[PDB]
Amino acid sequence: VLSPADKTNVKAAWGKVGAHAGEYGAEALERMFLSFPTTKTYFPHFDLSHGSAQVKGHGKKVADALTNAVAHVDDMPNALSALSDLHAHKLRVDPVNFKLLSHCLLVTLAAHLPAEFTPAVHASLDKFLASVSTVLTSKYR
Amino acid sequence: VLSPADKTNVKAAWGKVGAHAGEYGAEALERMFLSFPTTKTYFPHFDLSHGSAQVKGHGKKVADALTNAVAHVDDMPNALSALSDLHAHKLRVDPVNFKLLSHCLLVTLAAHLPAEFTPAVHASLDKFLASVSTVLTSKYR
Amino acid sequence: VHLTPEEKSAVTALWGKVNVDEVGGEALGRLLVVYPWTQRFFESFGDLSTPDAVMGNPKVKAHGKKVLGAFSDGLAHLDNLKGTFATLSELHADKLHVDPENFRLLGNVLVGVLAHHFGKEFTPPVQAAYQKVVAGVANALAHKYH
Amino acid sequence: VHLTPEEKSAVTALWGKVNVDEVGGEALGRLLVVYPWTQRFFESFGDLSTPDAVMGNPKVKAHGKKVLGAFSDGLAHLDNLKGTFATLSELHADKLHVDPENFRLLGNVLVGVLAHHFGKEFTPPVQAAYQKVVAGVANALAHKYH
Numbered sequence: 001v002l003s004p005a006d007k008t009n010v011k012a013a014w015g016k017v018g019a020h021a022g023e024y025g026a027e028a029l030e031r032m033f034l035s036f037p038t039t040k041t042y043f044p045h046f047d048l049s050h051g052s053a054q055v056k057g058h059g060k061k062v063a064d065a066l067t068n069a070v071a072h073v074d075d076m077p078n079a080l081s082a083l084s085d086l087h088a089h090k091l092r093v094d095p096v097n098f099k100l101l102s103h104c105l106l107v108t109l110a111a112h113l114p115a116e117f118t119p120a121v122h123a124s125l126d127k128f129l130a131s132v133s134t135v136l137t138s139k140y141r
Numbered sequence: 142v143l144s145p146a147d148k149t150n151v152k153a154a155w156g157k158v159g160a161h162a163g164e165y166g167a168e169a170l171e172r173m174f175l176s177f178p179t180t181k182t183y184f185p186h187f188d189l190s191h192g193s194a195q196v197k198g199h200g201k202k203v204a205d206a207l208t209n210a211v212a213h214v215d216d217m218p219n220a221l222s223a224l225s226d227l228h229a230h231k232l233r234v235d236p237v238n239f240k241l242l243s244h245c246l247l248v249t250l251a252a253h254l255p256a257e258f259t260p261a262v263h264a265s266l267d268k269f270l271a272s273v274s275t276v277l278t279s280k281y282r
Numbered sequence: 283v284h285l286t287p288e289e290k291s292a293v294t295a296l297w298g299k300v301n302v303d304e305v306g307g308e309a310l311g312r313l314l315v316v317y318p319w320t321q322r323f324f325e326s327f328g329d330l331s332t333p334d335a336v337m338g339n340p341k342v343k344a345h346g347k348k349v350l351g352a353f354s355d356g357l358a359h360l361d362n363l364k365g366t367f368a369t370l371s372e373l374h375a376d377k378l379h380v381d382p383e384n385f386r387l388l389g390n391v392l393v394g395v396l397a398h399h400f401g402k403e404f405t406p407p408v409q410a411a412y413q414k415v416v417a418g419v420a421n422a423l424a425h426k427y428h
Numbered sequence: 429v430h431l432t433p434e435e436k437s438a439v440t441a442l443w444g445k446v447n448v449d450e451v452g453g454e455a456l457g458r459l460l461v462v463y464p465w466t467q468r469f470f471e472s473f474g475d476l477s478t479p480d481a482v483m484g485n486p487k488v489k490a491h492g493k494k495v496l497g498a499f500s501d502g503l504a505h506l507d508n509l510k511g512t513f514a515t516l517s518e519l520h521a522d523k524l525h526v527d528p529e530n531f532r533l534l535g536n537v538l539v540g541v542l543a544h545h546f547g548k549e550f551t552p553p554v555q556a557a558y559q560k561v562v563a564g565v566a567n568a569l570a571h572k573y574h
């Protein structure tokens with residue numbers, strides 16, 4: 001469960017991201033595709049080239065869902081319910097990949113937040129991403 | 142989350158395990174130790190030879206806790222409370238090993254319950270073990 | 283992989299008793315039941331509505347037999363799985379787009395079926411050797427992923 | 429491990445800038461903060477109760493430098509991680525009893541710290557080369573587990 005301190009840390013760091021949420025989302029994807037090439041099997045329909053508008057576009061959507069998640073930290077399952085459905089019954093991404101994107105999102109935040117990414121904040125974000133991943137995979141079976 | 146059908150499939154199969162619960166637990170552990178040797182790092186204080194009293198005891202403690210979990214499926218978080226704490230603060234087993242032990246418990250069930258291990262039962266059991274695994278690791282951080 | 287001679291013999295001995303068609307169909311079916319997300323690739327096989335339906339779908343069973351037939355073939359080259367599977371590796375990554383995690387899921391379902399089929403003859407040491415083979419086949423298959 | 433000219437140049441060049449002492453203490457400290465169950469191996473190190481306590485604990489800092497100094501020597505032997513880490517593997521499995529999963533956790537955390545420290549210079553492709561490296565190291569340290 002996210003502790004009051006964790007909820008606090010998450011709101012404080014995400015806050016800081018602000019309107020860069022989108023660019024950060026795209027860089028997290030690029031990091032994922034290059035670091036973990038099996039994840040590209042889910043996007044045979046995209047141009048995965050550096051600078052791809054498709055990646056940008058998809059980065060922005062992911063980013064906006066996490067924004068929605070942050071705002072609804074006390075009620076995640078409802079807020080992400082359409083997304084849970086989607087991933088569970090249409091996309092059908094193996095649960096394993098969620099750890100991978102989470103890692104790359106953390107990496108992107110660390111590279112962008114020199115002051116804010118303290119050990120404490122790092123632990124709270126990790127816990128928040130694992131929580132987001134849990135909700136997204138909750139209706140799989 | 143467990144469907145009501147999953148709850149039925151689980152009580153059905155475990156009922157079947159009955160008195161052999163302890164023997165199946167020792168066997169699950171022996172399978173774990175041979176198949177996944179990094180798990181042995183958690184028992185450097187144990188005599189791990191075949192049929193050792195220590196393996197047999199732990200086996201029985203493991204089965205009792207699973208029995209307790211089947212008995213209180215609608216209330217796992219409460220029923221395994223003490224065990225969540227123990228694994229969280231004292232034992233601190235990396236969460237990955239729970240999947241390994243789960244797999245070996247599944248294998249042992251398959252080997253012992255020819256008539257009951259249907260595809261639907263198989264699925265409910267895997268979710269059940271995954272749920273137990275989730276409860277035991279829930280207080281980790 | 284690095285199987286000792288005794289391990290190699292255990293594996294080949296048990297494999298001698300397998301009806302590949304039957305077990306192929308069963309392992310694929312249980313894959314699709316236990317981890318339904320793996321269904322994503324089989325939209326063209328038809329009806330995967332219930333466990334009964336998956337298990338009974340002839341398309342599933344025919345795929346089960348081809349997959350396990352290649353597996354069976356690979357047991358003849360335990361000393362060179364990467365070589366044996368290089369071409370299938372390429373096909374799976376480049377045309378089929380199958381995340382190599384499914385290879386790991388199939389291998390653990392495979393072991394379950396072997397245990398359900400063979401009961402007490404599937405001892406712990408026997409499981410340990412099939413565990414090395416399945417991890418080895420999954421690694422050879424994931425090799426050409428780039 | 430297998431690194432392209434591109435990737436090898438990237439790893440060595442960034443490493444040149446790393447103060448092993450500073451980065452090693454940080455990487456170990458964040459490991460025990462982020463995944464607290466890893467504290468199980470460091471009972472004699474002191475108070476590890478809260479973040480501030482971990483980070484400025486002298487035994488943590490010390491141990492961080494040792495581990496990273498060993499990691500560094502491995503970078504000079506990208507071609508034979510296995511023989512380079514054979515002794516340490518045996519130590520970790522036999523004497524310290526450390527689940528090799530922790531090597532994977534450390535590796536992820538080190539990537540994080542290198543990102544935090546280097547910012548935009550730690551680009552996607554650089555990340556990528558470091559990810560193969562930490563996975564190679566993790567696998568070379570898990571080699572002697574029996």
Ligand code: HEM
Pocket residue numbers: 039042043058061062063065066083086087091093097098101102132133136
């Ligand atoms: C942080 C966890 C994730 C979040 C918040 C997330 C969020 C989303 C969103 C908002 C969409 C678009 C839905 C719509 O169009 O309204 C989407 C689609 C999709 N997601 Fe997820 N996702 C996550 C993880 C993943 C992972 C790990 C993968 C696989 C590597 C994945 C693969 C995709 C695919 C392939 C699509 C469809 C892309 C398209 O064809 O437009 N997602 N995701």
Ligand code: HEM
Pocket residue numbers: 180183184199202203206207224227228232234238239240242243273274277
């Ligand atoms: C289905 C999952 C599991 C269940 C239900 C479970 C249950 C138990 C129980 C009932 C105890 C004894 C508590 C007592 O004495 O008060 C125990 C202890 C312990 N468990 Fe867990 N366990 C599980 C998974 C694991 C895993 C995955 C590992 C490591 C590979 C592990 C390692 C240990 C150790 C080493 C002990 C202490 C043994 C001794 O010193 O007597 N457990 N567990």
Ligand code: HEM
Pocket residue numbers: 320323348349350352353370373374378380384385388419423
């Ligand atoms: C032991 C693991 C596996 C082996 C040896 C294997 C083997 C093969 C073989 C030999 C083919 C046909 C190649 C050809 O037509 O030349 C094939 C095709 C296929 N495989 Fe795999 N496979 C494995 C696992 C999987 C898994 C886990 C999935 C996904 C859930 C999968 C999905 C497919 C699909 C979608 C096709 C194409 C079917 C068609 O077009 O009829 N395979 N596989």
Ligand code: HEM
Pocket residue numbers: 466469470491494495496498499516519520524526530531534535566569
């Ligand atoms: C992954 C890269 C790692 C490398 C290269 C490595 C290297 C080392 C070295 C050089 C030593 C000193 C041993 C000697 O006396 O010869 C050591 C000790 C030790 N390592 Fe590792 N290590 C690694 C990871 C870890 C991890 C992740 C943990 C656990 C979380 C760990 C737990 C220990 C402990 C408990 C000791 C002994 C400390 C003491 O003496 O109290 N190591 N390691």
